[PDB]
Amino acid sequence: DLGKKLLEAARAGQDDEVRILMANGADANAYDHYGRTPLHMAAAVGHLEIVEVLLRNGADVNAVDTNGTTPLHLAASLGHLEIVEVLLKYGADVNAKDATGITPLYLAAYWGHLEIVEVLLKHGADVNAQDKFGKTAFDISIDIGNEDLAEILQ
């Protein structure tokens, strides 16, 4: 099964294993039973070359897992700037909401990835997006005490 191998190679950060498998007709849109696709795996582990090979082979750039989480949520939450940029170039959705209303900007703010926060805002990220508890990225900057963050949010 080429899908399982492609999921595993993207997760392991095996750049070439990925290229070999794509070469051999592996489906860039395979998914595991949680709905993670190879591009979620590559975005989460932070392997830029793998992210690019997948998007060139038609990987659904806003694929959602079973909780609504997209590859751009993962790269913004875990701090992978250059992956965040490439994803955006391919149509990544800055305002995607996961199952409790959380957005890539909310995660990048929560974990303190400020350059990512700037990049998302310049691409139209909605600052007033609230999770299902009513909390926005500005409420995060107050709760987590991040002054640079609160400043950036205006």
């Binding site: 949680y34 993670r36 979620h40 795996m41 989460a44 897992d65 079973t66 909780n67 609504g68 989480t69 949520h73 993962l74 939450s77 875990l78 996961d98 199952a99 409790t100 959380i102 995660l107 929560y110 974990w111 999770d131």
Partner: protein, 171 residues
Amino acid sequence: LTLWTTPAPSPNCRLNAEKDAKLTLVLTKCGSQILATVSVLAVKGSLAPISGTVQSAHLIIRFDENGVLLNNSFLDPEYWNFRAVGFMPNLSAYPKSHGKTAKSNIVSQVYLNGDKTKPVTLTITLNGTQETGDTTPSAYSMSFSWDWSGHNYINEIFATSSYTFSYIAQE
């Protein structure tokens, strides 16, 4: 004798939604002490894959004055049987409703995917619950609280390594 979930249960407990995880828990009675081994694997929901800013989960198992599960609410009684007060945590040592008593807690690190770079703390609390008003009381309880505050494990599946502990038995 052994009281357990079997070695490989089907989804049998609720961390956030019905049957959203498999808890493998084995209690073997060694006279005055229970020897136990535990692990958990989320199968659906917000811990499979870990999503948003979720950094904790918990499960509280309650038992009545005869050591029998209070109901099918939180751990499924079909995966819970002998292979029961003799397996309950000793109330003199772990006094009911006093889970904030240091000695009623056993705390240790377990590891996501069995990977030593992905720690998760597991706090087990014995008899830590207090029920009031109309709430049916439990006589005994065993709580598991997993916490990985400050670690960003989004996209991982919440699946832990296995861990052993023991505690004094009520009888």
